[PDB]
Design an enzyme around this catalytic site. Structure first.
Site, PDB file in Angstrom:
ATOM      1  N   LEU B  20       1.011  -1.215   0.146  1.00 22.70           N
ATOM      2  CA  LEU B  20       0.118  -0.193  -0.189  1.00 22.70           C
ATOM      3  C   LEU B  20       0.871   1.228  -0.034  1.00 22.70           C
ATOM      4  CD1 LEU B  20      -2.958  -0.827   2.464  1.00 22.70           C
ATOM      5  CD2 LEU B  20      -3.092  -0.409   0.038  1.00 22.70           C
ATOM      6  N   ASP B 139       2.081  11.601  18.139  1.00 16.56           N
ATOM      7  CA  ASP B 139       2.450  11.424  16.422  1.00 16.56           C
ATOM      8  C   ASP B 139       1.081  11.508  15.756  1.00 16.56           C
ATOM      9  OD1 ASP B 139       3.976  11.555  14.358  1.00 16.56           O
ATOM     10  OD2 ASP B 139       4.445   9.410  14.061  1.00 16.56           O
TER      11      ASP B 139
HETATM   12  C1  LIG Z   1      -2.319   5.888   4.765  1.00 20.26           C
HETATM   13  C2  LIG Z   1      -2.399   5.483   3.421  1.00 20.26           C
HETATM   14  C3  LIG Z   1      -3.780   5.761   2.793  1.00 20.26           C
HETATM   15  C4  LIG Z   1      -1.389   5.957   2.643  1.00 20.26           C
HETATM   16  S1  LIG Z   1      -2.357   3.515   3.049  1.00 20.26           S
HETATM   17  O1  LIG Z   1      -1.059   3.211   3.776  1.00 20.26           O
HETATM   18  O2  LIG Z   1      -2.338   3.643   1.853  1.00 20.26           O
HETATM   19  C5  LIG Z   1      -3.604   2.843   4.184  1.00 20.26           C
HETATM   20  C6  LIG Z   1      -3.054   2.485   5.406  1.00 20.26           C
HETATM   21  C7  LIG Z   1      -4.037   1.466   6.210  1.00 20.26           C
HETATM   22  C8  LIG Z   1      -3.630   1.157   7.534  1.00 20.26           C
HETATM   23  N1  LIG Z   1      -2.559   1.584   8.076  1.00 20.26           N
HETATM   24  C9  LIG Z   1      -1.960   0.840   9.238  1.00 20.26           C
HETATM   25  C10 LIG Z   1      -2.023  -0.212   9.421  1.00 20.26           C
HETATM   26  C11 LIG Z   1      -1.479  -0.879  10.764  1.00 20.26           C
HETATM   27  C12 LIG Z   1      -1.106  -0.134  11.658  1.00 20.26           C
HETATM   28  S2  LIG Z   1      -0.731  -0.582  13.309  1.00 20.26           S
HETATM   29  C13 LIG Z   1      -0.515   1.181  13.632  1.00 20.26           C
HETATM   30  N2  LIG Z   1      -0.896   2.204  12.856  1.00 20.26           N
HETATM   31  C14 LIG Z   1      -1.242   1.235  11.664  1.00 20.26           C
HETATM   32  C15 LIG Z   1      -1.614   1.945  10.251  1.00 20.26           C
HETATM   33  N3  LIG Z   1      -4.370   0.450   8.210  1.00 20.26           N
HETATM   34  C16 LIG Z   1      -5.904   0.248   7.694  1.00 20.26           C
HETATM   35  N4  LIG Z   1      -6.097   0.534   6.391  1.00 20.26           N
HETATM   36  C17 LIG Z   1      -5.397   1.187   5.742  1.00 20.26           C
HETATM   37  C18 LIG Z   1      -5.455   1.490   4.601  1.00 20.26           C
HETATM   38  C19 LIG Z   1      -4.918   2.438   3.599  1.00 20.26           C
HETATM   39  O3  LIG Z   1      -5.171   2.626   2.293  1.00 20.26           O
HETATM   40  C20 LIG Z   1      -6.273   3.217   2.069  1.00 20.26           C
HETATM   41  C21 LIG Z   1      -6.748   2.858   0.922  1.00 20.26           C
HETATM   42  O4  LIG Z   1      -5.738   2.733  -0.289  1.00 20.26           O
HETATM   43  P1  LIG Z   1      -6.071   2.115  -1.636  1.00 20.26           P
HETATM   44  O5  LIG Z   1      -6.056   0.507  -1.482  1.00 20.26           O
HETATM   45  O6  LIG Z   1      -4.964   2.606  -2.562  1.00 20.26           O
HETATM   46  O7  LIG Z   1      -7.583   2.759  -2.212  1.00 20.26           O
END
Ligand SMILES: CC(C)(C)S(=O)(=O)c1cc2c(Nc3ccc4scnc4c3)ncnc2cc1OCCOP(=O)(O)O
Ligand SMILES: CC(C)(C)S(=O)(=O)c1cc2c(Nc3ccc4scnc4c3)ncnc2cc1OCCOP(=O)(O)O
Ligand SMILES: [Ca+2]
EC number: 2.7.11.1
Lengths: 281, 284
Positions: B20, B139
């Protein structure tokens, strides 16, 4: 070996405590957490008994351990000499029972939302069955499928749940006198969701239901109950009929059930779920 | 007492593992083979250092302990000699950062939704601060405010979080944190509020971030005027007041999240329920 403790909530932190309903499971009240500034639901006893105390704590432990996207989220335990209750998130849209049967309040419940509810019930129960040891709900009914602000499913009432180590219409016939109980309840729920009908509506005595089901009778599958315009009607009848099979061994696992439902849910565009919710009162 | 163990997820149960994004770790989407749900995995950049190992397990434990309606829900820990990651629910609508700054994709982000996001960020952080001992995020940024299918908030990245007992941007960091506090999160929150209401990048005109630090340390903050914050913003005066008290130079003069919520509650009641659903359908 990562552990999480369930918070204890002092009774005085529950403001605007207002009765919602009463049942065999207990009394339900809505309140607001004084410090967290959120609406909460409290399933309390409302006469004190130490046997009822052990039951509430048992349920609270199960809910704490069973946390998942489609399970009612427990917020804390309110354990006091004065009062005892399980504090959870407030479900503003109530139950699946009310959504289906309050026809004047909800004239239309679009098919995408109905299928999404069914998918989420299967996701929730599958999670329970996949725990170590498996948790079996054993009391699934449309009254226990709660709906959040956007009509997403939260499974409630873990009073009869068991670690694999009221109404009888959702009960498999072998339970009158098993991992295959929940799938039976689920097949009846499916029929109820697609029909918006009360199972065995024409039957006045529940002994007549119990006798009929013991003989292999099930809620009626025809043009009047399940209209020909239901999306994936044939496939859904097949799922329902395998789910409520007389022989428990012939009923599917929730995994098999999900593998069947996944291609059906992919036929609906994402926006149609949002549109279904905006249509609703 | 009542205790819950965080499940361990075998790596082979994570199917369709797709990249991602990458940051200060890597985030991938996958599907749980048995649970039949989409998940997100924050894992280490594929070498496994035992110092980085302790860091992941520390955050996994904070997330497990900090479970609440506005916190990213942790589903399990994937701990193997081969791989190490935190498995959470997938947030289909990404971050608040993308919602605010992807202006072609999102020409309009209705005021009700903006206020609801701000209310839910405050609800999430207030919960953390009300734990025993309190948990301090440390953060918060628009990149860390994730949005579910209906644009409800889930606070993420607990890597710098602490129990009151290389990196990126500094724009949400209070000036007292620069050189070697419960009042940190409220500062980050005031900057987020400004960013939500303006849809502008804080200190956009400033090329060097060290010049930002020099400016901030002098008492400079993102600009509050007609161009950044138009006069048509619902409850503009009340919001400017909240922002200005939140990012005050003196930490002692910054409000608690409770005070902040008590102020926001009457504002959120001015919006009809359908306006939140309408705001989300507009974004689809
Ligand atoms: C942040 C972003 C939008 C650039 S992303 O990286 O594409 C993203 C991140 C997600 C996430 N992050 C996470 C997971 C586990 C942990 S443990 C502590 N902090 C975290 C943070 N968690 C859940 N869903 C996420 C979705 C994300 O993308 C959104 C959809 O993007 P796409 O598939 O390209 O439409
Ligand atoms: C089911 C109903 C709609 C008749 S309700 O009782 O009014 C109700 C119940 C809620 C609940 N119940 C709960 C709480 C804790 C536990 S622990 C294990 N199982 C439970 C079950 N939990 C959350 N929200 C609920 C909301 C409810 O009704 C919505 C209010 O209806 P209205 O006054 O018409 O707006
Ligand atoms: Ca668009």
């Amino acid at each position: 070996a990562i552990c999480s403790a369930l918070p204890t909530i002092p009774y005085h932190k529950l403001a605007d405590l207002r009765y919602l309903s009463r049942g065999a499971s207990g009394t339900v009240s809505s309140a607001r957490h004084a410090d967290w500034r959120v609406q909460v639901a409290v399933k309390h006893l409302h006469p004190l008994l130490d046997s009822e105390r052990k039951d509430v704590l048992r349920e609270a432990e199960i809910l704490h351990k069973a946390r998942f996207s489609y399970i009612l989220p427990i917020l804390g335990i309110c354990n006091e000499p004065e009062f005892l209750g399980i504090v959870t998130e407030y479900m503003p849209n109530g139950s699946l029972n009310e959504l289906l049967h309050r026809k004047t309040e909800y004239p239309d419940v679009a098919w995408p939302l109905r299928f999404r509810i069914l998918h989420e019930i299967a996701l929730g129960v599958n999670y329970l069955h996949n725990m170590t040891p498996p948790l079996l709900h054993h009391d699934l009914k449309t009254q226990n499928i709660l709906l959040d602000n956007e009509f997403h499913v939260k499974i409630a009432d873990f009073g009869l749940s068991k670690w694999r180590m009221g109404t009888i219409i959702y009960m498999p016939p072998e339970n009158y006198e098993s991992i295959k109980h929940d799938i039976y309840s689920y097949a009846v729920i499916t029929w109820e969701v697609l029909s918006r009908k009360q199972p065995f509506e024409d039957v006045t005595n529940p002994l007549q239901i119990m006798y009929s089901v013991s003989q292999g009778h099930r809620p009626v599958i025809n043009e009047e109950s399940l209209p020909y315009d239901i999306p994936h009607r044939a496939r859904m009848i097949s799922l329902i009929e395998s789910g409520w099979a007389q022989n428990p061994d012939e009923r599917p696992s929730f995994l098999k059930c999900l593998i069947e439902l996944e291609p059906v849910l992919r036929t609906f565009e994402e926006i149609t779920f949002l549109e279904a919710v905006i249509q609703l009162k």
